[PDB]
C-alpha cells in the first residue's frame, strides 16, 4: 500500500496529465505500439496504421487515448480503494479484448516514459517511485481478477 505522501506525488503529477489528456494519451499509445508492435494486433481498428505519422494523424487513436487515460485517472484517484472501477476493466480486458497481463506491464512502461518526457520537473525520482508503485498496485489487482477467471496473472 502507498503512503499518503506517495499518493500525493502521483495525483499531483496526474493533475497535469489532466491538463492535456489527449496529447498524453496519444504519446502513450504510439510509444506502446512502436516498442511492442504485437500489441497493435489487439485493435482491428488500428491495424491499418503502419507509420508513426499515420498514428499521429488518426483521430480515432487520439480518442482511444483519452478513453484509456480517463479510466486510469478514475482508478488513481480512488487511491488504495479502487475495486469498483477496476473490476469491469479487468473482466473486459481479460474476457473481451483478450489482453495478457504482460501488456499492462508494457503500457505502464509507456506511461512512465511519457510522463518523464513531458514533465522532467514534477516527475523526479520520488515521483517516479510513487507512480511505479501505483501502477504495480493496478496490475496486481487486475491480475488477481484474471486469476479468478482462468486467465490468470
Ligand atoms: C492502462 C491500462 C488500460 C486502460 C486504463 C484501458 C482502458 C480501456 C477502456 C476504458 C476501454 C473501453 C471499455 C472497456 O472495454 O473496458 C478499453 C477498451 C479496449 N482496450 Fe483497453 N485499457 C488499458 C489497457 C489496454 C491494453 C494494454 C490493450 C491492448 C494491448 C487494451 C486493448 C483494448 C481494446 C482491444 C479495447 C476495445 C476498444 C478498442 O477496440 O479500442 N487496453 N480499454
Curated annotation (Swiss-Prot):
Main location: cytoplasm
GO cellular component, one term: extracellular exosome
Domain Globin: 1-147
Residues that hold nitrite according to the record: 64
Sites where the protein binds O2: 64
Signal peptide: none
Modified residues (Phosphoserine): 3
Post-translational modification Phosphothreonine, affected residues: 67
Binding site for heme b: 93
Enzyme Commission numbers on file: 1.7.-.-, 1.11.1.-
InterPro entries: Globin (IPR000971), Globin-like_sf (IPR009050), Myoglobin (IPR002335)
Gene3D superfamilies listed in its UniProt record: 6.10.140.2100, 6.10.140.2110
UniProt function note: Monomeric heme protein which primary function is to store oxygen and facilitate its diffusion within muscle tissues. Reversibly binds oxygen through a pentacoordinated heme iron and enables its timely and efficient release as needed during periods of heightened demand. Depending on the oxidative conditions of tissues and cells, and in addition to its ability to bind oxygen, it also has a nitrite reductase activity whereby it regulates the production of bioactive nitric oxide.
Family: Belongs to the globin family.
Subunit structure of this chain's protein: Monomeric.
Protein known as: Myoglobin
Lineage, uppermost ranks: Eukaryota, Metazoa, Chordata, Craniata, Vertebrata
Amino acid at each position: 500500500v502507498l503512503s499518503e505522501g506517495e499518493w500525493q506525488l502521483v495525483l499531483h503529477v496526474w493533475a497535469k496529465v489532466e491538463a492535456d489528456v489527449a496529447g498524453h494519451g496519444q504519446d502513450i499509445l504510439i510509444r506502446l505500439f512502436k516498442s511492442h508492435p504485437e500489441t497493435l494486433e489487439k485493435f482491428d481498428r488500428f491495424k491499418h496504421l503502419k507509420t508513426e505519422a499515420e498514428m499521429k494523424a488518426s483521430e480515432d487513436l487520439k480518442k482511444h487515448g483519452v478513453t484509456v487515460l480517463t479510466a486510469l485517472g478514475a482508478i488513481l484517484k480512488k487511491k488504495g480503494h479502487h475495486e469498483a472501477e477496476l473490476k469491469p476493466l479487468a473482466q473486459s480486458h481479460a474476457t473481451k479484448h483478450k489482453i495478457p497481463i504482460k501488456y499492462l506491464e508494457f503500457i505502464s512502461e509507456a506511461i512512465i516514459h511519457v510522463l518523464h518526457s513531458r514533465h522532467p520537473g514534477d516527475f523526479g525520482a520520488d515521483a517516479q517511485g510513487a507512480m511505479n508503485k501505483a501502477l504495480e498496485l493496478f496490475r496486481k489487482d487486475i491480475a488477481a481478477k484474471y486469476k479468478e477467471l482462468g486467465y490468470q496473472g
